[PDB]
Amino acid sequence: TVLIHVCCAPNLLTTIFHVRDAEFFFYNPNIQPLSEYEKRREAVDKVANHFSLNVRYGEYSTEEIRKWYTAVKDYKDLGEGSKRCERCISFLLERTAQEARKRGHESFSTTLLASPRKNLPMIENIGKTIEEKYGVKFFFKNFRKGGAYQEGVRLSKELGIYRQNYCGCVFSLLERRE
Numbered sequence: 001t002v003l004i005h006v007c008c009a010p011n012l013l014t015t016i017f018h019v020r021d022a023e024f025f026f027y028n029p030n031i032q033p034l035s036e037y038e039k040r041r042e043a044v045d046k047v048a049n050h051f052s053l054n055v056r057y058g059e060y061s062t063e064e065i066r067k068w069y070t071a072v073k074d075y076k077d078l079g080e081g082s083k084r085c086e087r088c089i090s091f092l093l094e095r096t097a098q099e100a101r102k103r104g105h106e107s108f109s110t111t112l113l114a115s116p117r118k119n120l121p122m123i124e125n126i127g128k129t130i131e132e133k134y135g136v137k138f139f140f141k142n143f144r145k146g147g148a149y150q151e152g153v154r155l156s157k158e159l160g161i162y163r164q165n166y167c168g169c170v171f172s173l174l175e176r177r178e
């Protein structure tokens with residue numbers, strides 16, 4: 001059994017190709033503003049209601065976002081294996097392992113492994129650290145593969161799933177605008 005963190009609906013659509021019997025965990029205080037949080041949570045909720053997935057929605061609140069912030073407020077650098085995005089992702093998966101340890105699941109994972117390739121090493125390193133600290137096994141698979149990716153793209157266009165074009169945080173939204 002496994003608890004899977006959900007980053008976004010596109011990546012959930014890819015992940016269910018490979019693993020459909022998970023409890024899913026949408027927890028993303030890294031997202032600003034709230035209107036973008038809600039639009040993405042409603043994407044996922046659309047996917048879950050259509051495929052009858054078990055999704056649990058974590059906390060989003062002026063507190064939670066603030067724990068996130070100061071947790072990454074020291075760093076000014078973006079990208080895989082940047083310190084900031086390592087503390088970020090580590091914040092999210094820490095909460096997912098916490099929830100999985102509380103609920104008794106044996107393993108945790110994340111739809112972040114449905115993301116481009118080049119991100120897998122950083123996410124695997126974080127997962128293993130977290131595993132060590134909380135005693136929930138980190139499950140690693142490249143979810144893009146075996147056609148899952150273009151399946152999940154197929155359904156994204158058929159179902160009108162919102163596909164975001166920035167990471168989530170205000171830093172990356174400045175980044176996209178450049």
Ligand code: SF4
Nearest residue numbers: 085088167168169172
């Ligand atoms: S802002 Fe960029 S690096 Fe910061 S958490 Fe979101 S995606 Fe990761």
Ligand SMILES: [Cl-]
Nearest residue numbers: 007008011115
């Ligand atoms: Cl992503």
Ligand SMILES: [Zn+2]
Nearest residue numbers: 007008009011
């Ligand atoms: Zn995502």
